[PDB]
Amino acid sequence: SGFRKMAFPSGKVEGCMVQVTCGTTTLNGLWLDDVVYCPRHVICTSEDMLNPNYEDLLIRKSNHNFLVQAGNVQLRVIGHSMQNCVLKLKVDTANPKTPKYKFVRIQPGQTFSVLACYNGSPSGVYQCAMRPNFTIKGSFLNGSCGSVGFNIDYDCVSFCYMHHMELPTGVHAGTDLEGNFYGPFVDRQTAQAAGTDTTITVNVLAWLYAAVINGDRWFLNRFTTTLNDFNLVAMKYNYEPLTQDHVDILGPLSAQTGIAVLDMCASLKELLQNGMNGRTILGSALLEDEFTPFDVVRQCSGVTF
Amino acid sequence: SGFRKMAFPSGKVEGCMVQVTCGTTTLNGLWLDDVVYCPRHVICTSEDMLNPNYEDLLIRKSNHNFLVQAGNVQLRVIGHSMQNCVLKLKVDTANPKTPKYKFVRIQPGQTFSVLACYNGSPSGVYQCAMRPNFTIKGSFLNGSCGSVGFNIDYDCVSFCYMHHMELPTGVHAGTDLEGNFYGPFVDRQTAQAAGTDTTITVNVLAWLYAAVINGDRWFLNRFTTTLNDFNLVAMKYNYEPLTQDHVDILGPLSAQTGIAVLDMCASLKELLQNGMNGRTILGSALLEDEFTPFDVVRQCSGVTF
């Protein structure tokens, strides 16, 4: 028992982190097979970032202007191409530590592990959620660009995120591993608006199930509601609308706990309308929305890699 | 910027996790050099655990009753000894993936990473704190015994914790890597009382500095206090007494932020006496006590491994 925000074990990813240097910008890249991937803004000075012309900036770069180091070993670059917002540097050497891997584009409300890196070296690992507005609330200092987010599936690493920028607001934006941004963002130091964010309703309901499983039950009330009644409260409170898809993904948890999804919705409604009284659920005084139903289940049944 | 509960990268530890089976108890062990370490209660049935005589139970065990598997490879046991509450099984093979390592005994309020494992396989990683009462609030299912806690120091892994038990209360207890329990606990399924717990005052003050660094300043008030005045409030609220040692460890953060420790104490006093108003600090509606001053600094300056 116990419930904690758990990251995937990062070992597999740690063996793919390299340093990429171009001019005097250094950041992190991901060495898979004979390709290194990194943010294309490695080719930008601090001044370029204000209004980059990436094709123009890239045309002035040859293979030998890219200094790619893997710990102490230094790889040799035999090809460079830009794919959307990522550089793909082709190197002479296939990474011997390449895990089985996919590149995945995730959906808002989905969660993943970030291996926060500086200079091609691991700093730490934490579990994040792609906000509905396609930002993440991470921990990212200067040099952390190129750090990746991933899910692990037995022995396969699904890369879903590469870090590219902090917005003037202090939140974080980046791309899938094909270089397409999550959200409306672009790789330029300009003021850029993240939309209204919202709470991930289905995730919050999963966490309430986790709570019941771990014995926090005080918030279970004796009322019920309908899907539409709930949603019209959800909207008032900046919560994502709960669909049938979401009810269905909560289905297994419903079966474990013997609490109908719509009765858990009635509990949450009375939390939303009434707050918590200075009381706590699984040690938190707020409603947590960074556990997916799958996360609650993996943690509660204890899946390994 | 951003502030998150960050674990160490676990790669180094993942390569030391083995499965240990004895009779039909299976748990996790730690294979370093030619020694496997695990909880001695691997030799107990569910019934033994009620009143184990470990020396008697161990005397009925030979080397070949210990089934130690490292992924698919199965090691051969050439020696077994009990050291306090851990078995040390001596194996024919030195672990090729043995990191540089120490065994460390930590102090209450210190933090570490847990690599939660089942059957010798990594499940996840999260950052924990040794409570003042020497328990931890972890996530530990059946089979998680032998999972370790560690700190990493560039390339050296300091093992500080091996998981042994859940108390009837749902919290967690275990040993250092020499087999001495943290706290008054013993490896027997009996009702066992953890003392009154308290908040780790120095950790909470570190987190308030982290907050100021990241721009949450609303809680900074215009009052001051003395060390003794503070402590006499701290005690009333079940907070650890702040010593000069603690003020001194907060010294660097004081210098970064230009806020005297005793003025941050005055802020916290007014949080303690007055609460938070439904307001949040670094996204939390409670005061967080699981970041040490060193953690805040590593995260804020971004140290790598």
How would DSSP label each residue in B41-90? GGG--TTGGGS--HHHHHHT--GGGEEEEETTEE--EEEEEEETTEEEEE
**B144 near A CB under 8 A:** yes
B299: nearest Cα among A163, A138, A72: A138
Q: Which fold has domain A1-14+100-197?
A: Thrombin, subunit H (2.40.10)
Q: Is B20 exposed, middle or buried (0-12, 13-18, 19+ CB in 10 A)?
A: buried
Spatial neighbors of A143 by CB under 8 A, at least 6 apart, are A26, A27, A28, A118, A119, B302
Tell me phi and psi for residue A145, to 5 degrees: -55, 140
Rounded to whole angstroms, the Cα distance separating A260 from A184 reads 37
**Rounded to whole angstroms, how far apart are CA atoms B189 and B187?**
7
Closest of B160, B114, B103, B137 to residue B14, by C-alpha? B114
| φ, ψ for residue B173, nearest 5 deg | -140, 150
Closest chain A residue to B151, measured at CA: A124
B41 a catalytic residue: yes
Pair A144, A136: CB distance under 8 Å: no
Q: Give contacts of A 199-238 with B, CB under 8 A.
A: 214-215
CB contact under 8 A, A284 and B280: no
Determine the residue of chain B that is closest to A71 in CA distance: B305
Question: What is the longest distance spanned by two Cα atoms in chain B?
Answer: 69
Question: 């606990």: which residue's tokens?
Answer: B185
Tell me the structure's resolution in angstroms, rounded to a single decimal: 2.0
Q: Which residues, other chains included, contact A43 with Cβ-Cβ below 8 Å and sequence gap of 6+?
A: A22, A23, A25, A54, A57, A58, A61, A87
Kindly give the interhelix angle for A261-274 and A227-236, rounded to the nearest 10 degrees: 30
Distance CA A294, CA B208 (A): 33
**Residues of B in Cβ contact (< 8 Å) with A112:** none
CB A3 within 8 A of CB B116: no
Query: What secondary structure, in 3-state letters, does B16-35 show?
Result: CEEEEEECCEEEEEEEECCE
Taking CB atoms and an 8 Å limit, are A3 and B278 in contact across chains? no
Pinpoint the residues of chain A covered by CATH 1.10.1840.10: 198-301
Q: How far apart are CA B240 and CA B107, in angstroms?
A: 13
CA–CA distance from A263 to each of A49, A94, A185, A189, A217 (Å)? 51, 54, 39, 47, 13
| Every domain range in chain B assigned CATH 2.40.10.10 | 1-14+100-197, 15-99
Report the distance separating Cα A4 and Cα A256, nearest Å: 20
- B72, B125, B141, B305: best mutation site toward chain A, by most A Cβ within 10 Å? B125
Strands A111-118 and A121-129: antiparallel
Residue type, B11: G
Taking the CB of residue A94, how many other CB atoms lie within 10 A of it? 11
> Residue B3: closest CA among chain A residues belongs to which residue?
A139
Residue indicated by tokens 């065990």: B61
A2 reaches B (C-beta below 8 A): yes
CATH entry 1.10.1840.10 includes domain A198-301: yes
Give percent helix, percent strand, percent coil of chain B, each to the nearest 5.
Answer: 25, 30, 45
CATH C-level class of A15-99: mainly beta
Please say whether the beta carbons of B26 and B39 come within 8 A. Answer: no
